[PDB]
């Protein structure tokens, strides 16, 4: 009859009162899905209200409502009415029946024709980072999978009426396997069903579709469930996926850790290097793990035996040799650059004659350093812990070359600045050494950027204040003229350091205000330096004992992956780790040639 009383009838489950609703709807041509029977803000129809007010797990008014709805002919719209509120948008009546753990009602709605692929797009159905509470994959099957409801999942995937395919993706592209990685915590109770349901769904999608691998459907961000686990810091599911073993012969091609031979305790296991070492063909789980993973569990995942032994093998094969070759090449290039700048005659305006053999050597060295700079630009624009400092160095050297070609002498200074950055950059090579490691890891880049900001502020302050002071100077020692500003800046810097002389005060007309301004300037410069040192010590002690004890593994992994990425793709494939092995027959019957890495271990239980 009316919404306020009807919502009370369904809540109380009084079937004896809902008797007259059907004749009322027939005589007034009204359907249960009209706004006269819907809460305006939440669009919640009668059925969603009926699905929370449950006594003993049953609500007898729901079959009556469905019977009335079918007579009205609005059964499809009544069974699939979505919420409209920003906090619950898209939530149909199926999601409520799955969250409430009511398998009987889930069966009822799925039989009546509920939308089995209804995406819940509400704010609460968004990831925690994006401002949400429960991100379950937005799908009715994904909600059941993330709610630990294996029977409801099986029912949804094997309905006589309509089955939900496991290959479906939500707005963000997260499939059912992706939603099990975003709901997986590191606790032991949570990982004993996330992995179990992960394997259940993987095998179910393998038998239903033999030609499709559900672990191969990338989301919108290009991440498979393994890469998502690596990025989001989920150690347990990551270990389960990298160490997955399945016994069923029909679906035994989904395994990744194939036992090869055993001798009592010891046994050899071939791990599958799929997305762990792609040789640059696609995203590699190792690269996301070292760089993209910002979680504190990065070292635990790097300690997983396949990854750790793969990194060790990469270091053994070409890591040390190529690292030392890179160190020698940089050192020699920097020495060449230092020599060519030094021997440069700078006779009058640029350019300068290269007729002399020494001049020809200078020209050759300039060509070499220009080639190095343009190579760094090529790498950076191909991309577009020291990348930024190698880029700035190259921009500076190209600016210097442009000034030298223009005939501007100022090039030396710009060129000199570049050289300084080149010596600072060499510390990347020293990142491994324990003594200067902590300095090379984060100080030389992050601290240099904050330091550049700090001396930018300092230089602007000093220049403006020098102008303010020279406004007070006696026009006509430090008398006002054309070159007053530069010499005055020199004197001001000398007094700031301590090697200044109070010959400045003799020129000025008004000693008292000049003294006041200078003492205030010393106060502010001391404050600037003190705040700089405070930030320095704060983000130095930001590194702690746990940090400094764990960083080394990560830094060595960074060193080896950079060296391995520096190689061309054919050279990348030439130094591949592992060998092809016939792991077994695939679904189509053909043998699977997988690059596998052999790891030897023991089990005493």
């Amino acid at each position: 009859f009316n919404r306020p009383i009807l919502f009370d009838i369904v809540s109380r489950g009084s079937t004896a009162d809902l008797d007259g609703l059907l004749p009322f709807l027939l005589t007034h041509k009204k359907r249960l899905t009209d706004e006269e029977f819907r809460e305006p803000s939440t669009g919640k129809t009668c059925l969603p209200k009926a699905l929370l007010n449950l006594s003993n797990g049953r609500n007898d008014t729901i079959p009556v409502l469905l019977d009335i709805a079918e007579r009205t002919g609005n059964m499809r719209e009544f069974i699939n009415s979505p919420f409209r509120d920003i906090y619950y948008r898209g939530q149909t009546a199926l999601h409520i029946a799955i969250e409430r753990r009511c398998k009987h009602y889930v069966e009822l709605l799925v039989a009546q024709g509920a939308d089995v692929h209804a995406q819940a797009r509400g704010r609460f159905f968004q990831p925690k980072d994006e401002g949400g509470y429960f991100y379950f994959g937005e799908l009715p099957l994904s909600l059941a999978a993330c709610t630990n409801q294996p029977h409801i999942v099986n029912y949804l995937t094997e309905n006589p009426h309509k089955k939900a395919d496991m290959r479906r993706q939500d707005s963000r592209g997260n499939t059912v396997l992706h939603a099990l990685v975003a709901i997986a915590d590191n606790t032991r109770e949570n990982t004993k069903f996330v992995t179990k349901m992960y394997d259940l769904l993987l095998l179910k999608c393998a038998r239903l579709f033999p030609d499709s691998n559900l672990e191969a459907v990338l989301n919108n961000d290009g991440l498979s469930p393994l890469m998502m686990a690596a990025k989001t810091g989920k150690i347990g599911i990551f270990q389960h996926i990298i160490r997955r073993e399945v016994t069923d012969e029909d679906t035994r091609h989904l395994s990744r850790k194939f036992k090869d031979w055993a001798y009592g305790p010891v046994y050899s296991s071939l791990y599958d290097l799929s997305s762990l070492d792609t040789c640059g063909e696609e995203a590699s789980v190792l690269e996301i793990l070292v760089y993209n993973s910002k979680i504190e569990n990065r070292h635990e995942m790097l300690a997983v035996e396949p990854i750790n032994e793969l990194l060790r093998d990469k270091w053994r094969k070409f890591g040390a040799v190529s690292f030392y070759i890179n160190v020698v090449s940089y050192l020699c290039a920097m020495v060449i650059f230092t020599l060519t700048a030094y021997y440069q005659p700078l006779e009058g305006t640029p350019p300068y004659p290269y007729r002399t053999t020494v001049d020809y050597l200078r020209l050759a060295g300039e060509v070499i350093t220009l080639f190095t700079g343009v190579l760094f630009f090529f790498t950076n624009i191909k991309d577009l812990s020291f990348q930024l400092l190698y880029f700035i160095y190259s921009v500076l050297v190209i600016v210097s070359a442009a000034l030298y070609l223009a005939g501007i002498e100022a090039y030396l200074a710009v060129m000199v600045f570049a050289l300084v950055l080149g010596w600072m950059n060499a510390l990347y090579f020293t990142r491994g050494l324990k003594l200067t490691g902590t300095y090379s890891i984060m100080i030389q880049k992050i601290l240099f950027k904050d330091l550049f900001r700090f001396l930018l502020v300092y230089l602007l302050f000093m220049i403006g204040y020098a102008s303010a002071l020279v406004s007070l100077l006696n026009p006509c020692p430090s008398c006002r003229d054309s070159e007053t500003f530069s010499t005055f800046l020199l004197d001001l810097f000398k007094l700031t350091i301590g090697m200044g002389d109070l010959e400045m005060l003799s020129s000025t007309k008004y000693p008292v205000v000049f003294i006041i301004l200078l003492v205030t300037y010393i106060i502010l410069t001391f404050v600037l330096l003190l705040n700089m040192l405070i930030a320095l010590m704060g983000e130095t002690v930001g590194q702690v004992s746990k940090e400094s004890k764990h960083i080394w593994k990560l830094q060595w992994a960074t060193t080896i992956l950079d060296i391995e990425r520096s190689f061309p793709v054919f050279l990348r494939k030439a130094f591949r780790s592992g060998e092809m092995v016939t792991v077994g027959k695939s679904s189509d019957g053909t043998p699977d040639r997988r690059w596998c890495f052999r790891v030897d271990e023991v089990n005493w239980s």
Binding site: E35, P40, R76, E77, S81, P82, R84, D115, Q169
Partner: protein, 180 residues
């Protein structure tokens, strides 16, 4: 493989063949007597370029509370099918004034398609006489392209729900634009 779902929203003036077009596309049968104000909560299976797409047909109306809840249908849309009757021109001159702004305000960077529904009436004698009584003529196809030029829409195709002509290629174009 997996059938992607695209959200389709059909906006237009009162009685411009929106719900009739949706029903003809979905149920394949032109409604005889009881055409609902809005055809809601239906997903239609379509194949484009050998790819399965489930079109979540969302309908909007201009009567009573529907004017109030039409804004809430716009979020998460993938393609907008603005509708105007070929027989009734007032919708055509109103499309740029009201429909183009409302869609743009709630649906930025979303493909826009304007469709000429009730195309069969272009040659109808009764409708022509009724328009001449008000000093009007049916929307020409050149006029439709001229209207699409102002908006910059994805395309302009005419539909006749009663005759079931053009009711398929329009949705094919809509899902092709949504796939972009």
């Amino acid at each position: 493989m997996a059938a992607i779902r695209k959200k389709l929203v059909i906006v237009g003036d009162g009685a411009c063949g929106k719900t009739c077009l949706l029903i003809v596309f979905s149920k394949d049968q032109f409604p005889e007597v009881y055409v609902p104000t809005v055809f809601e909560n239906y997903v239609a299976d379509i194949e484009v370029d050998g790819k399965q797409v489930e079109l979540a047909l969302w309908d909007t109306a201009g009567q009573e509370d529907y004017d109030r809840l039409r804004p809430l249908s716009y979020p998460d849309t993938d393609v907008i099918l603005m509708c105007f009757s070929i027989d009734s021109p007032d919708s055509l001159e109103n499309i740029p004034e009201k429909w183009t702004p409302e869609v743009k305000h709630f649906c930025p960077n979303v493909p826009i398609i304007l469709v000429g529904n009730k195309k069969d009436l272009r040659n109808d004698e009764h409708t022509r006489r009724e328009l001449a009584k008000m000093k009007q003529e049916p929307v020409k196809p050149e006029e439709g392209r001229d209207m699409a030029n102002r908006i910059g829409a994805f395309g302009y195709m005419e539909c006749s729900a009663k005759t079931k002509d053009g009711v398929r290629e329009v949705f094919e174009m809509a899902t092709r634009a949504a796939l972009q």
